[PDB]
Amino acid sequence: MVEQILAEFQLQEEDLKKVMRRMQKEMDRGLRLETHEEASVKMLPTYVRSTPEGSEVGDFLSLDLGGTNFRVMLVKVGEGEEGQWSVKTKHQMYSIPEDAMTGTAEMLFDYISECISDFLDKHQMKHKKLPLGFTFSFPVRHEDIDKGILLNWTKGFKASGAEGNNVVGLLRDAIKRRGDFEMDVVAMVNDTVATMISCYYEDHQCEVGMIVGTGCNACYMEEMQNVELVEGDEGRMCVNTEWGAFGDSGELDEFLLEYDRLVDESSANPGQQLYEKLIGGKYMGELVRLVLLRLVDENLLFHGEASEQLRTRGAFETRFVSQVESDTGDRKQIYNILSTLGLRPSTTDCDIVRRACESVSTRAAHMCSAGLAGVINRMRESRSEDVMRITVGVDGSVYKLHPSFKERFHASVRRLTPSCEITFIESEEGSGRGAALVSAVACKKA
Numbered sequence: 001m002v003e004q005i006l007a008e009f010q011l012q013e014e015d016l017k018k019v020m021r022r023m024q025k026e027m028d029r030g031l032r033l034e035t036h037e038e039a040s041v042k043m044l045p046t047y048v049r050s051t052p053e054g055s056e057v058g059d060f061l062s063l064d065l066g067g068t069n070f071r072v073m074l075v076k077v078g079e080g081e082e083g084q085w086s087v088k089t090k091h092q093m094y095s096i097p098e099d100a101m102t103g104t105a106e107m108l109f110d111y112i113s114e115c116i117s118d119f120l121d122k123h124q125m126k127h128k129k130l131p132l133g134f135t136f137s138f139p140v141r142h143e144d145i146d147k148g149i150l151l152n153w154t155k156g157f158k159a160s161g162a163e164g165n166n167v168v169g170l171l172r173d174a175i176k177r178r179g180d181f182e183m184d185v186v187a188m189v190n191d192t193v194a195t196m197i198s199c200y201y202e203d204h205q206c207e208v209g210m211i212v213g214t215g216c217n218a219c220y221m222e223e224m225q226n227v228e229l230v231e232g233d234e235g236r237m238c239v240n241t242e243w244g245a246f247g248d249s250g251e252l253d254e255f256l257l258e259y260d261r262l263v264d265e266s267s268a269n270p271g272q273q274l275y276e277k278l279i280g281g282k283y284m285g286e287l288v289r290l291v292l293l294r295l296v297d298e299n300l301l302f303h304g305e306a307s308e309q310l311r312t313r314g315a316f317e318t319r320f321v322s323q324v325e326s327d328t329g330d331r332k333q334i335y336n337i338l339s340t341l342g343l344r345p346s347t348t349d350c351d352i353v354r355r356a357c358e359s360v361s362t363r364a365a366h367m368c369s370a371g372l373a374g375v376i377n378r379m380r381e382s383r384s385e386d387v388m389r390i391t392v393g394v395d396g397s398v399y400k401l402h403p404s405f406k407e408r409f410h411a412s413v414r415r416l417t418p419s420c421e422i423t424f425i426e427s428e429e430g431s432g433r434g435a436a437l438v439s440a441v442a443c444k445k446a
């Protein structure tokens with residue numbers, strides 16, 4: 001029975017409360033000196049602090065590295081009503097070559113600095129020496145707002161000899177070893193951090209950032225006294241939970257399915273990022289693919305016959321998941337996806353594939369809701385407030401564009417967060433505006 005195979009994806013409320021409590025426990029472990037180093041949830045102080053210690057105005061360069069495409073953009077920051085407006089003015093996107101991303105650090109950052117030029121020249125501006133904000137969507141141990149070493153690549157990145165190294169250095173070398181231009185690199189932030197920062201003008205309650213895109217992560221404003229790895233008890237600092245690695249010490253073992261185990265084993269980073277592998281768009285289409293393969297090996301789908309493409313890793317794209325679940329019921333979208341994959345599905349084949357899609361994506365919404373509710377309830381407790389009103393800034397294609405993910409996600413987080421009133425804001429150019437606003441504050445020292 002297909003329903004019996006799909007039922008393995010369900011999570012009961014008690015399963016979610018369990019996931020939630022365990023996440024809260026790992027978050028606490030990551031923050032404490034005695035456990036931070038062994039912690040699966042690393043809880044990385046980011047050096048982004050509360051209060052407006054003045055902001056510079058003008059134009060800022062923003063880099064965005066964290067997918068196969070790299071982005072360079074210009075953001076103009078200025079003074080006003082609530083404070084500082086920000087707006088992307090010029091933007092250019094760049095694909096990284098196959099052998100550039102598998103090259104070396106020094107090399108990849110050369111392709112990156114090269115790309116900064118194709119943008120600088122192509123916009124009448126190689127002569128400018130701009131402040132630079134770098135959104136870099138990989139786990140970094142910060143020493144400061146402008147200094148921090150990459151702990152490891154995630155999401156299938158692999159450039160050699162980049163791990164263990166100050167990432168801002170690597171970038172300032174490619175800037176020297178280019179002669180071309182001069183840029184001052186003032187801040188490196190995680191994408192979660194940028195997204196939250198980008199909503200803060202519109203909403204001063206925005207103190208969490210969450211990405212549900214290719215990967216899955218969040219950050220939030222922690223009490224400085226709770227942040228044991230930075231001296232000081234005063235104010236708040238932003239903590240990059242890196243919750244993607246929740247489960248890398250076995251915390252999700254009772255939930256993982258044969259599909260999860262296979263995605264993990266054939267991944268670039270086996271044994272790591274296990275929570276993220278349940279949720280992120282890098283993995284969601286692959287999960288459905290494996291579920292489809294299981295259904296077929298059992299003769300419950302495509303009369304037990306799978307195409308060449310269907311048996312290939314990566315072929316069931318995450319965007320297909322989202323398109324399958326947008327089908328209006330006439331099966332046209334489903335049929336056209338499958339047919340392109342060299343399949344000839346029946347009416348019941350289409351409906352099964354839809355069901356497989358719903359199961360994978362519902363489980364990602366719910367699994368993700370437990371992570372966030374854990375963050376929100378911790379913060380409600382830390383701040384000692386009765387009804388906590390909080391805004392979460394959110395970005396990522398899974399959340400923004402999968403037709404039912406956001407609604408299932410919001411319903412499930414609200415269920416797990418009594419006495420919290422959560423406002424969700426989808427960020428508008430969160431990466432670039434976010435890196436720009438941090439930059440503009442980091443430009444009060446210099």
Ligand SMILES: CS(=O)(=O)c1ccc(Oc2cc3nc(-c4ccccn4)[nH]c3cc2CN2C(=O)CCC2=O)cc1
Nearest residue numbers: 047048049050051082083084196197200201437438441
């Ligand atoms: C004027 S305004 O009110 O429109 C306005 C003000 C700030 C804005 O972004 C920020 C930039 C920052 N740069 C640093 C930094 C940088 C270096 C060292 C230490 N700190 N910290 C920052 C905090 C924020 C805002 N911030 C919070 O305070 C809680 C959640 C959040 O996003 C956005 C709009």
Ligand SMILES: OC[C@H]1O[C@H](O)[C@H](O)[C@@H](O)[C@@H]1O
Nearest residue numbers: 137138139154211215217244
């Ligand atoms: O892009 C979302 C997330 O992807 C992975 O989880 C990265 O390790 C993390 O830094 C990033 O925030």
Ligand code: NA
Nearest residue numbers: 224227230232
């Ligand atoms: Na502290």
